[PDB]
Amino acid sequence: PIVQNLQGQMVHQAISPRTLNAWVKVVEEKAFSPEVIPMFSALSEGATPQDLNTMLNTVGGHQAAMQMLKETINEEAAEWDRLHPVHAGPIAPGQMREPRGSDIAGTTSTLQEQIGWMTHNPPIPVGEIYKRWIILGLNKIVRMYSP
């Protein structure tokens, strides 16, 4: 995640193993139950896309759901690209590039790039955009997996 250091700057720090394991354990115990979404939300505080793929990729089991989510993440990403067209002409030397759906999904962007966008002024909340897609896709799952 990207956290504030004592000095008063935003720097990246790694997520903790008993945080990781707590994510694992939630999924083990409460599967598709709604409490998973606030839980997720708390444990995703200050998290990167990269950390969010890590969390999704580290799941075991419920592979039908994991595939449905993936496909929702790509749909929501396809929709990001649709709604926000690429911008006019070449990229400025003085500036950094606008993200695509795949940069938001973490796929085409690097960590330093993910830190550029979030730490820069104005900052862009690529975590929160992926977060809604995850929560939206979580609703899809919850609604389906209701019996």
Next chain:
Amino acid sequence: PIVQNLQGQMVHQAISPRTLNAWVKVVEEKAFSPEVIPMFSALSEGATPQDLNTMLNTVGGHQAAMQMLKETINEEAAEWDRLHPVHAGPIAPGQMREPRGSDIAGTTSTLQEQIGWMTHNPPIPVGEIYKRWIILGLNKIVRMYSP
């Protein structure tokens, strides 16, 4: 691992016992399952070659796989040496030596040497080169150990 200190420099710090034990426990529980690879990747964040041999050497069980991996690590290392020839003439006093496959595997290099390469400017990502060999060799294993 080599971590950033509060002062704003990169220094080595030792890996934690409940990190070690978490590595052990993953292997105990999920054996050759694919979730082992993201898991590995997270727990290998900022790790040295030396720490990576420590993790491989501390395995118990699955010795056929452990040997297949070793032999993959040496093949990938042999390939490093092939692709990157040694450089022209004697080593400069002002400079430090280029790595070989065995320095990447941690074998011929010392820790201070592993810290020289990574902390120096430009830095060389000898962790990430070994990491791909580990992940590649993990694919070999996963594909074989599928039933």
Next chain:
Amino acid sequence: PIVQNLQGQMVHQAISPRTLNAWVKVVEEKAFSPEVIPMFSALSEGATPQDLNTMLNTVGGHQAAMQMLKETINEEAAEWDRLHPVHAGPIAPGQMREPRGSDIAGTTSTLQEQIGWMTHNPPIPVGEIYKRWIILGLNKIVRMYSP
């Protein structure tokens, strides 16, 4: 152990209880298995002789092995004294004394003395000398305790 403080000096800090207990638990679970040696090596990072006797003395069980090790430690120590004779004439006021096998084994030296040797410039690696004796004696045990 002797660790580096934030200020940038080497100072002694005590070893942790869940480190101690992790040493205990390894021995409980994996007895004479080879994974014990890398494991030992990691948990002995930056350790003193004094801490190494603490770890050996806190063992319960496997007393035949513990005696074989002791006797290996004394043999290796006797050998240290043989190979390295005492030096010419009286000890200088400006200098500190050279170690013997028993100082390496921690027996005849005090902690402050163990910190003098390691922290001083040049430093002498009395941990690493005892460490080889421990590892050597670990090989003896492993080879015997193979069935």
Next chain:
Amino acid sequence: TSILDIRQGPKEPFRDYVDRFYKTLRAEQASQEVKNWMTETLLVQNANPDCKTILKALGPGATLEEMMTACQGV
């Protein structure tokens, strides 16, 4: 176990089968296009006659929630 060996039982819920499929698909490393081909093809083909019948009625263009709710009583 190979992906071709993944098949739906005569009494096995589709759901339990689809889980098995994307687990084994999860251990296949092929290009995405090939894995798309496997999805639309092999899944239905090794599905049981009763559900297979059901899935033929959904036509093409169908998505996983609709397949999964379609073969629920079977």
Next chain:
Amino acid sequence: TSILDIRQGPKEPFRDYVDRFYKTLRAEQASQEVKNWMTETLLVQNANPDCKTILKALGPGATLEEMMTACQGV
């Protein structure tokens, strides 16, 4: 137990035997060259007749994934 005493059962999968071999090989401390000699030699020699037959057909130059997939039905 000594490395010479490691042998494959008449019904034991090779796989379970190869695991036993590199565990015991893991408790041998000999030079690498000697341990290479042990690998190509002793493993096949104490392998069962049915797999032994199989392994003779792989010829030399063979690697562990190919040996391990070669004696799978045996």
Next chain:
Amino acid sequence: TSILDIRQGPKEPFRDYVDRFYKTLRAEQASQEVKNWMTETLLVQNANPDCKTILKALGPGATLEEMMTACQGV
């Protein structure tokens, strides 16, 4: 399971039923106004005759502690 399928048993305490209701209501995502409509309507409607009778005597304007204490002996 759908919200319409939530009903009170003939021997089931209302309390255990009301818990089931706001759990299933917890998985409905509808506008608050609709969910208010569901609250005053469906809860009583699928309540058992003995408690249903009781709840009719509370009249309208009633709140959950009073409903929950009202159908306690039933």
